[PDB]
């Protein structure tokens, strides 16, 4: 019913104080004034996304030897649900099995595999980079910033005209725009 366009030039994010929110600054055309003016758009609720790489066999962390129990997506799912999420204070998340490639400088990773994709809110704590478990060997996407996620997910290639649907009004000003 209402949609508004704006030409973004610069973007800002404050991970430490305001996690999961980004600011887009640009120019908006005005019919009444016959000229463009400054504009600020707040984008909220950007979710942390992580990828868990399962093992080919279950490894006992205490000794360092396999137990002969096959590993599936469901085993990683339950281990995350009952061991990791509770430990690191995570209330709500979303999990899905995905197929992904990898061709970079981390040893012992297949070039095509099934990963466990976990998305959750950015307000919740940040998992360690080197976190390891019984059912998963490695985790990717721990320290990815919100701005890069927003840029890659929506395919924004430099400055351009963006459409925002269902615009909302801020209660109190947050900018000099």
């Amino acid at each position: 019913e209402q949609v508004f366009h704006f030409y973004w030039l610069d973007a800002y994010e404050d991970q430490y104080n305001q996690p999961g929110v980004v600011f887009l600054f640009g120019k908006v055309w005005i019919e009444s004034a016959e000229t463009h003016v400054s504009c600020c758009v707040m984008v909220k609720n950007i979710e942390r996304t992580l990828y868990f790489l399962p093992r080919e066999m279950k490894i006992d962390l205490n000794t360092g030897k396999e137990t002969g129990t096959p590993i599936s997506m469901k085993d990683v799912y339950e281990e995350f649900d009952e061991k990791i999420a509770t430990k690191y204070k995570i209330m709500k998340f979303k999990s899905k099995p995905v197929e992904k490639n990898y061709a970079f400088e981390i040893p012992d990773v297949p070039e095509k595999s099934e990963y466990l994709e976990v998305k959750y809110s950015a307000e919740m704590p940040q998992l360690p980079q080197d976190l390891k478990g019984e059912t998963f060997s490695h985790v990717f996407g721990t320290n990815t910033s919100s701005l890069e996620l927003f840029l890659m997910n929506r395919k924004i290639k430099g400055p351009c005209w963006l459409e925002v649907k269902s615009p909302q009004l801020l209660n109190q000003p947050v900018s000099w725009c």
């Binding site: 061709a103 297949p110 070039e111 095509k112 595999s113």
Partner: protein, 389 residues
């Protein structure tokens, strides 16, 4: 009585794959005594399923998975490939360039389609006993060389199913040959330089290699029984025009005048021999042997043996067109092989129903199966003797 029904194939194939296929011998052969770590888990199998479905990179862990995945799928055709560095069903895991074939048996094939200018008895789609000698003559021509010239000991000969034979050389030192060596081996055994319809395909010098001598010696025992009395290459003008097309130009007139006075094919062949010797004496390409070699020497294809990752028909399979089982050939009785007495899956089944699993002992497939473990048994003797001491 009734016509052979190809549409009944799905019905018989099930009980064949449940109660008749030699899974144990298959595993023993393709495992090779379990000497190496993953010599069977790295082997590639190709299955041709319903609707010409072509799946290529398959692999299995051990025997039980093998039986389970042929009993749950029942392929129309089975092909065996090479062993790789990684599991064929797990090749997308590795980086592009690290998945490559390493070892494979040495495969030879001989087919009826290579004798289109030699058969005058049946068409391209027909075979008959009086030309099947062209297949047995080949078997003793090649098996000799691999046994004598190259010293290959373990060779398996299998019936292709309708119009040819396959040879599997499975010796330990043969499975690791480079592709260039296989190409050279095929070059050594190749004699007819058949191109795109070249007039002359066989050339000989004054000095003949011992291989050529032994090949001529073997052919001599069956030449008159097949070429002169069964094929009658000298019975019509167009028939002997083909042979005159290879003779030097100065001889045809004398050959025609000597042949017009003849009354039988044997006498014509003797006259040709005398004329050839007489022309030789004055002027030696050995005219007597080129037409003999051109008409009987087997023709091989380089592309089949050159490739280290080639996929070839597996033994103990079923031809979906004729129904004949790709059966091993007993090397002790080669000249007496009859392609028409090989039992079909339909033959044994109908009588049986009117009456760890070892149900095959009472079947008509069993006498041919005893050939297989004899090949299998000879392999452990080589392992036990040479390796352990």
């Amino acid at each position: 009585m009734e016509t052979f029904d190809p549409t009944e194939l799905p019905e018989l194939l099930k009980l064949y794959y449940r109660r008749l296929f030699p899974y144990s011998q298959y595993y023993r052969w393709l495992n090779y005594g379990g000497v190496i770590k993953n010599y069977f888990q790295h082997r590639e199998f190709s299955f041709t399923l319903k609707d010409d479905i072509y799946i290529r990179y398959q692999s299995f862990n051990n025997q039980s998975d093998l039986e389970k995945e042929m009993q749950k799928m029942n392929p129309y055709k089975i092909d065996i490939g090479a062993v790789y560095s990684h599991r064929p069903n797990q090749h997308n895991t590795v980086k592009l360039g690290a998945f490559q074939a390493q070892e494979k048996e040495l495969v030879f094939d001989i087919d009826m389609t290579d004798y289109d200018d030699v058969r005058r008895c049946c068409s391209s789609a027909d075979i008959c006993p009086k030309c099947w000698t062209l297949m047995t003559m080949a078997i003793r021509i090649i098996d000799r060389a691999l046994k004598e010239d190259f010293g290959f000991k373990h060779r398996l000969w299998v019936y292709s199913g309708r119009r040819g034979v396959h040879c599997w050389v499975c010796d330990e030192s043969v499975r690791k040959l480079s592709s260039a060596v296989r190409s050279g081996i095929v070059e050594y055994l190749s004699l007819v330089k058949g191109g795109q319809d070249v007039k002359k395909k066989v050339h000989l010098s004054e000095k003949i290699h011992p291989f050529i001598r032994k090949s001529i010696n073997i052919i001599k025992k069956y030449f008159e029984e097949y070429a002169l009395v069964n094929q009658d290459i000298l019975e019509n003008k167009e028939s002997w025009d083909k042979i005159l097309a290879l003779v030097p130009e100065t001889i045809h007139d004398e050959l025609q005048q000597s042949f017009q006075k003849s009354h039988n094919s044997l006498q014509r062949w003797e006259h040709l021999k005398k004329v050839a010797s007489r022309y030789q004496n004055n002027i030696g390409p050995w005219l007597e042997w080129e037409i003999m070699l051109q008409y009987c020497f087997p023709r091989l294809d380089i592309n089949v043996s050159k490739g280290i990752n080639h996929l070839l028909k597996s033994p103990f399979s079923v031809h979906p067109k004729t129904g004949r089982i790709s059966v091993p050939i007993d090397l002790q009785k080669v000249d007496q092989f009859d392609p028409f007495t090989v039992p079909t899956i339909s033959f044994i089944c109908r009588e049986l129903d009117a009456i760890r699993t070892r149900d095959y002992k009472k079947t008509s497939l069993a006498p041919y199966v005893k050939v297989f473990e004899h090949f299998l048994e000879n392999l452990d003797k080589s392992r036990k003797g040479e390796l352990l001491k």
